Structures are given as C-alpha cells and as structure tokens.
From a paper:
ADP-ribosyl-acceptor hydrolase 3 (ARH3) cleaves PAR and mono(ADP-ribosyl)ation at serine following DNA damage. In contrast, ARH3 has a unique ARH fold and a di-Mg2+-containing catalytic center and can efficiently reverse not only PARylation but also mono(ADP-ribosyl)ation (MARylation) at serine; ARH3 can also cleave O-acetyl-ADPR and α-NAD+ in a Mg2+-dependent manner releasing free ADPR. While coordination of two magnesium ions (MgA and MgB) significantly enhances its catalytic efficiency, calcium binding suppresses its function. In the active site of ARH3, acidic residues, including Asp77, Asp78, Asp314, and Asp316, maintain the integrity of the bimetallic center and render the ideal alignment of the substrate for catalysis.
Numbering used by the authors: 14 to 43, 48 to 59, 70 to 363
Write the structure that this text describes.
C-alpha cells in the first residue's frame, strides 16, 4: 500500500515471496485440499527452500556492494550452497556452484554456459530469486539488465534468463501500485515482444521446437484465459504449465496474480487478496514452492505489508531477517 516503491511494498514483496516458498513447499511436486491446510497457520516451523536461500544471497550481494557485482554474487551463491546444500536445489545448478567454489574459476559466467551440453539451463531458478533486483533498481532498463545478469550466473539459456526478466518486470510493475489487470499484462507483453525479437532468443526457441517468441505467446494466452468462462485448474496447467522450467512457471505465477486481483467465490472471502493469490497458486500443483514464491513476490509488492498475515508470516523460517533485508534495500537503494 501507499506510494510507489514504498517501504510497505518492499516489505510485502519479500514477505509474500517467503510465504509462497514456505507454505508452497508443503505440496512440492504434487483447492479444498489447500484451504484445509492453511487452517494450520491460524513459530518458524516452515523451512524455506532454495528459492529463499538464493534470494537472500542475491539481496545480500546487492547490499554489500550497493550495486550488481557478478563475482561477489556468484561467490555468495556458491558459499550459500556450501553452507546449506540441502535446501532443495536443482540437480543441474549444483554443478555451477561447485565450479564457482574453485578459486581458479575467474570468469563466473562460464560454468552456467557449459550446462546442458553448452545450451544453459532453462529452469526457473533464475526467476525464483529475482525479486530483489526490482527492489534495488527503479528503472525498467536497469531491471532488465540486472535481472538478466543475475540470472546468467546460473541460467545461460535465453529461456531461463528471459523468464527471470519477465518475473522481475512483474515485480517492478507491482511496486508501482494500482493497475488494471489488462494494463499490467499489456506492459509485460510489450517488453517480452521486444526481448524475444533478439536473434539469440529466436534461435533457442526454434531449436527446442517452441513457438516463436515463447514468453510473448504465453502472455497472449494469459489474456485469453483471463477472458474465458469457467477456467479450470487443468486448463491453466495445460496452457501455461506448472513445472520447473521457467517458461512453465513464470507466466503461471503472473496469471495467478492477475486472476486473483478480483475476488473468487470459490475462495472464502475471509482471505485477503495476498492470501487468495497464494492459495490459488498452490492449488495448481506442480512446482508449488516456486510458483507460489513468484506469485507472492508480485502480490506482496502490489498489496503491501498490510496484507501479510502475522500468523502466516511468523510460521516462516527467517521471516525477521527477510523483513530486515527488505528494509535495508529500501534504505540503500530507494534512498527511502
Ligand atoms: N537445457 C536443458 N535441457 C534439459 N533439461 C534441463 C535444461 N535446463 C534445465 N533442465 C532441467 O531442469 C532441472 C533444474 O534446472 P537447474 O538449472 O538444475 O536448477 P533450477 O534452479 O532452475 O531448478 C528448477 C527448479 O527445480 C527445483 O524445483 C528447484 O527448486 C527449482 O525450482 C535440471 O535438473 C534439468 O532436469
Ligand atoms: Ca524450492
Ligand atoms: Ca521449486
């Protein structure tokens, strides 16, 4: 709530992401279902996962250098994994961390590029952690630049890093405050259409047999879905995905945010807009921790800290450190 890029929006953003990670992790890889479960939330018994672990490292690097520093951030990613390897990291990305831990590795972008036979990862790990980029940078141009660079430390495929940019742009727009769902989507579609005109993105999509301009095509499908009668969970998953690939989860999280901007008679009205967004996201199944962490980052930025329920927040491991980091970003980079 309040002004664009307010303290409340910064706090709400990281808290919403933490809630999505911790609450979503219950159902990892799997709606009356979910409603029963969240009743348990009415201390810090819900562990966070790699989503939050990497988001913390990304934010701590930004705060330490008051800028993006690829060497500092890569080493904080690698040291965070060394300290706590069991947070549920992707099977592939652990190879990047182990190469970065070698002090002879002096070009910190090359391990990511070697992944998957030199094509790079298209997993959603670059996007799951990216919200802090949009807290640190107000400009659309800087958000894209550093969403891409931060993502490329582990995700060198355009499918991976453009998913991170798209998620960062969504958080960026949510921090600006009230919007129609149609305007919000149209802004994202315009940005992705511009990025997916790049020859590198066209090649990656072609070689995987995908639609030309894959994120753009899925954002167009979101627009159609938002106009469709009686949309079911199966239909959402069939059109957008609920998977570990960035292209099968970042649009899905954005859809969850946009859909839940209005009340849903199937979710009890006692839940606020942030809560109903998280509940709806988790009800899609699949990679629930990451889809919920990304939808929650967007919704938290949009609705603000006043919609973060204390009962839910205080169930989450590290919620106080998360909140302090949000306040530090607002001080150091928003210069409040
Ligand atoms: N180019 C590719 N070709 C084939 N498979 C791939 C490719 N890229 C990714 N994969 C598959 O995608 C997997 C993960 O890619 P990873 O780069 O390890 O890590 P992440 O951080 O993105 O993890 C993605 C999510 O998975 C968990 O839920 C985590 O919590 C994340 O939310 C690989 O092991 C491959 O099977
Ligand atoms: Ca996770
Ligand atoms: Ca995940």
């Amino acid at each position: 709530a309040g002004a664009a890029r307010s303290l409340s929006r910064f706090r709400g953003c990281l808290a919403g992401a933490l809630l999505g990670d911790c609450v979503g992790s219950f159902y990892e890889a799997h709606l009356t279902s979910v409603l029963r479960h969240v009743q348990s939330l009415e201390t810090e018994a819900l562990y966070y996962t790699d989503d939050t672990a990497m988001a913390r490292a990304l934010v701590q690097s930004l705060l330490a250098k008051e800028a993006f520093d690829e060497v500092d951030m890569a080493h904080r990613f690698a040291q965070e994994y060394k300290k706590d390897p069991d947070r549920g990291y992707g099977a592939g990305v652990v190879t990047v961390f182990k190469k970065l831990l070698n002090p002879k590795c002096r070009d910190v972008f090359e391990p990511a590029r070697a992944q998957f036979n030199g094509k790079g990862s298209y997993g959603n790990g670059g996007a799951m952690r990216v919200a802090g980029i949009s807290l640190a940078y107000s400009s659309v141009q800087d958000v894209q630049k550093f969403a891409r660079l931060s993502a490329q430390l582990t995700h060198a495929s355009s499918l991976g890093y453009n998913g991170a940019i798209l998620q960062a742009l969504a958080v960026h727009l949510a921090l600006q405050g009230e919007s129609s769902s149609e305007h919000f989507l149209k802004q994202l579609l315009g940005h992705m259409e511009d990025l997916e005109g790049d020859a590198q993105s066209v090649l990656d999509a072609r070689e995987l047999g995908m639609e030309e301009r894959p994120y753009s095509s899925r954002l167009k499908k979101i627009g159609e879905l938002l106009d469709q009668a009686s949309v079911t969970r199966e239909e959402v998953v069939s059109e957008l995905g609920n998977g570990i690939a960035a292209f099968e989860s970042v649009p899905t999280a954005i859809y969850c945010f946009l859909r839940c901007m209005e009340p849903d008679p199937e979710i009890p009205s006692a839940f606020n807009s942030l809560q109903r967004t998280l509940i709806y996201s988790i009800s899609l199944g699949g990679d629930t921790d990451t889809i919920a962490t990304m939808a929650g980052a967007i919704a938290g930025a949009y609705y603000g800290m006043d919609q973060v329920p204390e009962s839910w927040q205080q169930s989450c491991e590290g919620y106080e450190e998360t909140d302090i980091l949000a306040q530090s970003l607002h001080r150091v980079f928003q210069k409040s």
